[PDB]
Amino acid sequence: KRSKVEIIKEKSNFLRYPLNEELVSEAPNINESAVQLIKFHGSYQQTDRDVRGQKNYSFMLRTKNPCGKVPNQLYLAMDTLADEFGIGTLRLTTRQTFQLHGVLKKNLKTVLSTVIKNMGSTLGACGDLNRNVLAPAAPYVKKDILFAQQTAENIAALLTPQSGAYYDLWVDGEKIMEEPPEVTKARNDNSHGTNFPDSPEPIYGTQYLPRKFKVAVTAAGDNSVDILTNDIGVVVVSDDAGEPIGFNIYVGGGMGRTHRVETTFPRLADPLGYVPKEDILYAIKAIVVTQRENGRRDDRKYSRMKYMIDRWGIDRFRAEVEKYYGKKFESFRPLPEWQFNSYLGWQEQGDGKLFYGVHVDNGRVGGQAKKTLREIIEKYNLDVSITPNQNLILCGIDQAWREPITTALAQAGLLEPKDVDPLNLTAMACPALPLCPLAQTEAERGILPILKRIRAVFNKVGIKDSESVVVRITGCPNGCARPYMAELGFVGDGPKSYQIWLGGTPNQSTLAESFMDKVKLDDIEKVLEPLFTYWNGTRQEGESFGSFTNRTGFDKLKEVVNKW
Ligand code: SRM
Ligand code: SF4
Ligand SMILES: [Mg+2]
Ligand SMILES: [Mg+2]
Numbered sequence: 001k002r003s004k005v006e007i008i009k010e011k012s013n014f015l016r017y018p019l020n021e022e023l024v025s026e027a028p029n030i031n032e033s034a035v036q037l038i039k040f041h042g043s044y045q046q047t048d049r050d051v052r053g054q055k056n057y058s059f060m061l062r063t064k065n066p067c068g069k070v071p072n073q074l075y076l077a078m079d080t081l082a083d084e085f086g087i088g089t090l091r092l093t094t095r096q097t098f099q100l101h102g103v104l105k106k107n108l109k110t111v112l113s114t115v116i117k118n119m120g121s122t123l124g125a126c127g128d129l130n131r132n133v134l135a136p137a138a139p140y141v142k143k144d145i146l147f148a149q150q151t152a153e154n155i156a157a158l159l160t161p162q163s164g165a166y167y168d169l170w171v172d173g174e175k176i177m178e179e180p181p182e183v184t185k186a187r188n189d190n191s192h193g194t195n196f197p198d199s200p201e202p203i204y205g206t207q208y209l210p211r212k213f214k215v216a217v218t219a220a221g222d223n224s225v226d227i228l229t230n231d232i233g234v235v236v237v238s239d240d241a242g243e244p245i246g247f248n249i250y251v252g253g254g255m256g257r258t259h260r261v262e263t264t265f266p267r268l269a270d271p272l273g274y275v276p277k278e279d280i281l282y283a284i285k286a287i288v289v290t291q292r293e294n295g296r297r298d299d300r301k302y303s304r305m306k307y308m309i310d311r312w313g314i315d316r317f318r319a320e321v322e323k324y325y326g327k328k329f330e331s332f333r334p335l336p337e338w339q340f341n342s343y344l345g346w347q348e349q350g351d352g353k354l355f356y357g358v359h360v361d362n363g364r365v366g367g368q369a370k371k372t373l374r375e376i377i378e379k380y381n382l383d384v385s386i387t388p389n390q391n392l393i394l395c396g397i398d399q400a401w402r403e404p405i406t407t408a409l410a411q412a413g414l415l416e417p418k419d420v421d422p423l424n425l426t427a428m429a430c431p432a433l434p435l436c437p438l439a440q441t442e443a444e445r446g447i448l449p450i451l452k453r454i455r456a457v458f459n460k461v462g463i464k465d466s467e468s469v470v471v472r473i474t475g476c477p478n479g480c481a482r483p484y485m486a487e488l489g490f491v492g493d494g495p496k497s498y499q500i501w502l503g504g505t506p507n508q509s510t511l512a513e514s515f516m517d518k519v520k521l522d523d524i525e526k527v528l529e530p531l532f533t534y535w536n537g538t539r540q541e542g543e544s545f546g547s548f549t550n551r552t553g554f555d556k557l558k559e560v561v562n563k564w
Pocket of ligand 3: 126127
């Protein structure tokens with residue numbers, strides 16, 4: 001027994017048909033087969049859910065940018081495309097990519113080929129494939145940060161579709177201007193029966209993966225990447241002099257779940273083991289292959305790797321992976337405590353240049369903010385990078401540029417961290433309505449008024465305005481803003497209501513739990529005021545809301561809410 005998507009992939013000639021014929025039909029949309037295929041090419045057909053009556057079809061596009069790195073030429077091309085063919089905005093994402101919403105079917109090939117001819121790609125941004133690979137977004141020249149970044153690039157390249165469908169459709173097969181040889185040799189290796197050596201996809205095969213697959217790379221300590229949520233987390237381990245020697249690996253995280261279906265759940269990734277640095281790409285493929293061959297393909301709700309690991313347990317999974325790796329994992333090595341880093345504000349690269357992280361609420365770049373960011377990036381010929389908290393880092397800045405860049409940013413309303421509510425600095429919301437077809441309610445368009453209401457509750461209770469909690473909001477339980485790691489998570493569960501989740505911590509090292517269902521938007525103060533009063537009244541010195549939640553436990557918190 002096999003899902004509808006499996007058959008679509010099977011009969012597509014490696015992601016070509018009938019997408020190829022649908023792209024040139026006169027209709028404003030494309031058929032269901034083509035709807036599923038185009039995801040693999042980094043585009044999503046959407047309809048605007050605000051405009052009553054009619055189906056206004058449009059296409060969202062998502063880029064592929066390992067480590068969040070965006071060359072100058074790409075940023076300029078994307079900025080112009082958003083205005084010419086989109087709806088005037090770029091959307092920075094929780095996986096360090098751009099989305100561009102609103103593109104009409106007839107302009108889609110113009111847009112994607114422009115991306116392609118300007119040092120970018122959308123290949124594999126969606127689909128049953130490896131998604132954008134995360135890495136530390138800060139452009140530090142420190143050796144282990146550079147090594148984390150190189151590794152994410154290499155992993156992304158390894159797991160890039162090889163069929164040629166992408167260039168066939170978007171640029172009529174022409175050639176666009178080299179991967180390290182370690183990548184090529186790893187991809188080619190079949191000493192342990194990992195590959196399909198005669199297939200146009202030696203790793204993916206005809207069927208690709210059972211579902212999206214997510215990888216995050218970082219250096220010890222830096223949890224900007226929210227590593228525990230990914231299919232694979234990879235951590236650089238270095239000797240005492242800061243020279244990288246290998247990687248710790250984690251497996252089997254995921255956020256996605258469905259309301260009222262308790263066999264679906266978020267899950268933290270398990271520590272799997274350590275490998276020496278030369279082995280990383282072999283170990284990554286082994287893991288991918290184990291999911292390829294064993295993840296469920298009958299029911300897509302249960303297809304992500306977190307489920308096979310939940311069913312088999314981590315030891316049986318390890319053993320299976322070790323058959324494709326051809327050797328044993330070493331013991332996972334100790335790591336320091338995780339820390340969240342925003343990379344915001346003025347900092348040093350380590351090579352004489354500065355970087356500046358720009359706070360962007362929800363990653364939505366538009367209006368004057370967009371115009372000013374483009375002027376700066378273009379005038380100073382800056383490369384940039386996207387952070388997993390939907391923010392933008394301006395790289396490679398000369399000391400003499402710091403003042404005029406600062407002045408321009410401030411003039412457009414783009415404030416430095418010290419002038420932003422600390423709630424906003426760590427908050428995230430998904431796009432949800434109006435273009436998300438799975439949204440049950442608002443997230444991006446509701447979060448800002450929610451934050452002000454939280455700050456007003458703090459004020460009322462007597463909490464200082466420099467105190468904060470991590471607030472994440474989604475419009476549905478898919479978890480695109482990783483709400484299940486929040487200190488205070490709001491997960492859409494009706495048209496005007498949120499399920500509230502507590503128990504995440506400031507460094508994203510813990511999984512939250514479901515605290516109350518169907519809290520109506522108007523009622524959130526009834527829940528938040530007692531919680532925050534009790535935190536303020538009985539927290540230990542400097543104890544975060546999340547740690548306090550986990551120490552106190554849900555029975556006592558519910559009692560406090562119920563007696564309010
Ligand atoms: C833009 C972005 C959210 C954001 O505010 O930044 C996003 C937006 C959507 N995600 Fe997501 N997801 C984004 C990262 C995530 C993450 C976070 C992460 O990867 O760290 C998760 C949770 C981790 C996980 O995958 O478990 C997430 C879990 C989902 C799911 C649930 C997946 C599952 O296996 O259960 C879906 C729906 C699906 O795949 O069926 C989904 C599907 C969607 C769709 C494409 C809706 C759809 O299927 O048509 C989104 C479009 C909204 C729009 O109108 O633009 N998205 N999605 C995400 C940043 C993504 C990127 O690749 O560049
Ligand atoms: S979490 Fe739900 S509502 Fe939000 S973007 Fe993802 S799918 Fe859409
Ligand atoms: Mg997909
Ligand atoms: Mg942000």
